[PDB]
Amino acid sequence: QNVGTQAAEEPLNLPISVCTAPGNCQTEADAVVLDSNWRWAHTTTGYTNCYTGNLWDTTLCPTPETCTTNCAIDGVPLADWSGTYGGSVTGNKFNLKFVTVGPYSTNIGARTFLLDSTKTRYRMFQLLNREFTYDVDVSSLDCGLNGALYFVSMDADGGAAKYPTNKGGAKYGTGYCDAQCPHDVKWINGLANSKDWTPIPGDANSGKGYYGNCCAELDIWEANKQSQAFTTHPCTPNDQTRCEGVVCGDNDSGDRYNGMCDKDGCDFASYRMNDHTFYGPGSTFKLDSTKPFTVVSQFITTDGTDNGDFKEFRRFYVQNGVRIENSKVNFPGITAYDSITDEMCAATKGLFGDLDDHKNKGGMKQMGEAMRKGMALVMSIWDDHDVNMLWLDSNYPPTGNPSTPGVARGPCPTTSGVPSEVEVTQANAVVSFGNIKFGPIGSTV
């Protein structure tokens, strides 16, 4: 995309801490940028929309190459972050509102990325043999909503170096890809994704174009107050790849397990792994989701070095000063795993009857190659038009028997999560991600 002249791009400052040992950290002066999907797209030398609601203007955008010539994406000034998009920062805490009813329109959901101290590139994290940690508040997110923090194998400059027609790069939140190979990305490989664009029924704001955009993804946190998961999604290859046909692994053509990305990923979700009491909204759960807590993630390698292969994603929590170890897998004949490993993935997927696409895509080792190259940090809040978040917090499939291992993922009703309902009932939901810390293992708490 070209860049417009109607509004200055002003990302929100967000300090994080880079640590060398327990309680010994230095501030890093980073900032948050809005994904280019949420930006106003209009004529390059005027005011006229190129995209409105969930459609491209067919006169300005008869083809992607003409679309891209005629149109531009514009900036988000400070005032609009809060007024239009519902983003704000207080000290080292970032807050994202699910629904923001602005002056002249309504915004639903948000995806944002962390920029480095220059505000010119994404802050890339090389996660192998490191620990990443943050404080979270999800007490106001219920069934159907997801406040997610995760990493993806985006390019640090948004693709600007590879794609000449991308003039915005990271400064305009360009280049989003993930292991779902999404077709709802509006700009891919520096071009409008306007070919064969189709609105999403029941989503006034989105559609799906001809291409998708795939890359590896490491989900640190997929959650609401009812259920939470962490998940590895390798791809072959791991880097940003525009896809079409079977390579995207589209759910709608029966191709979920035929594409380049592991779509299901290898998940550790406490409730699905059969500990219903570990996490939930109340003081008698082990971890109380009505209150804020710290989430620690350790990326362990085969040799304890930056050069080894990734072998294990470990997790623990701290809440009101109390260290809380992860829950464990709880099924007869299955070892009580408390972390993600290749072995854990094969045992659990074998029990659940799930295809081990994680292993087919090269497993922990392949996931770690992505982490070694460096991944971008994403913070988002969203509802789910395809499956109503039932995969995260209910029975999936909803017709499945919940005593069958793998089906039950949380206590929410199978009728929950309908976007038109949650956008009313949960209009005030807000996720907070704060006090981010990154360092060697053992250094962040």
The tokens for 328 are: 């464990």
Return the structure tokens found at 406: 């793998």
CATH number at residue 84: 2.70.100.10
Torsion of CA 410, 415, 418, 422, to 10 degrees: -70
- Cα-Cα-Cα-Cα dihedral sign, residues 413, 416, 422, 425: negative
Cis peptide before 397 (omega within 30 of 0): yes
> How far apart are the C-alpha atoms of 109 and 430, rounded to whole Å?
10
Please confirm, yes or no, whether 10 is among the known catalytic residues.
Answer: no
For every residue of 169-237, DSSP letters joined together read: GGGGT----BTT--S--SEETTEE--TT-EEETTEEEEEE-S-EEE--EEEEEEE-SS-EEEEEE-BSS
The Cα 313–Cα 254 span in angstroms is 30
Tokens of 91: 């000290």
CA triple 103-107-111, angle to 5 deg: 135
What token pair was written down for 21? 């040992």
How many CB atoms neighbour CB 62 within 10 A? 14
Q: Where are the beta strands (DSSP E) in 48-125?
A: 51-52, 55-56, 71-73, 87-90, 93-97, 99-101, 106-108, 110-115
Q: Report yes or no: 312 and 300 within 8 Å, Cβ to Cβ.
A: yes
The whole-angstrom separation of Cα 71 and Cα 77 is 20
Dihedral angle over CA of 45, 47, 52, 56, nearest 10? -20
CB atoms within 10 A of CB 90: 9
Q: At 67, which helix (H) or strand (E)?
A: helix 64-70
Report the candidate in 232, 233, 222 with the shortest Cα–Cα distance to residue 259: 233
- Residue 89 CA to residue 103 CA, distance in Å, equals 21
Residue 125 is given by DSSP the state: B
Helix/strand/coil for 255 = coil
Q: Can you give 303-369 as a three-state secondary structure string? A: CCCCCCCEEEEEEEEEECCEEEECCCCCCCCCCCCCCECHHHHHHHHHHHCCCCHHHHCCHHHHHHH
Q: How far is CA 366 from the centre of its chain?
A: 19
The token pair at 122 is: 């994404």
Q: What angle do CA 55, 163, 66 make, to 5 degrees?
A: 40
Considering the candidates 9, 28, 131, 217, report the single residue annotated as catalytic. 217
Domain that holds residue 377: 2-445
Question: What span, in angstroms and rounded, lies between the C-alpha atoms of 289 and 226?
Answer: 8
Q: Kindly state the tokens that stand for 243.
A: 């896809």
Are 269 and 278 within 8 A, CB to CB? no
Phi/psi for 307 (5° steps) reads: -85, -10
DSSP class of residue 11 equals P
Tokens of 68: 């891209």
At how many Å resolution was this determined?
A: 1.9
For residue 122, give the DSSP letter. B
- Dist CA 422 CA 384 (whole Å): 10
CA dihedral 39, 44, 45, 48 (to 10 degrees): -50
Name the residue among 223, 219, 311 with its Cα closest to residue 265: 219
Return the sign of the alpha-carbon dihedral for residues 381, 288, 228, 342. positive
Angle between helices 342-352 and 363-373 (to 10 degrees): 130
312 is catalytic: no
The token pair at 117 is 């101290």
Pick from 398, 423, 418: nearest CA to 408: 398
Per the structure, the count of domains in the chain is 1
Measured in degrees and rounded to the nearest 5, phi and psi for residue 183 equal -90, -10
DSSP code for 410: -
**Centroid of chain to Cα 72:** 25
| Amino acid at residue number 175 | G
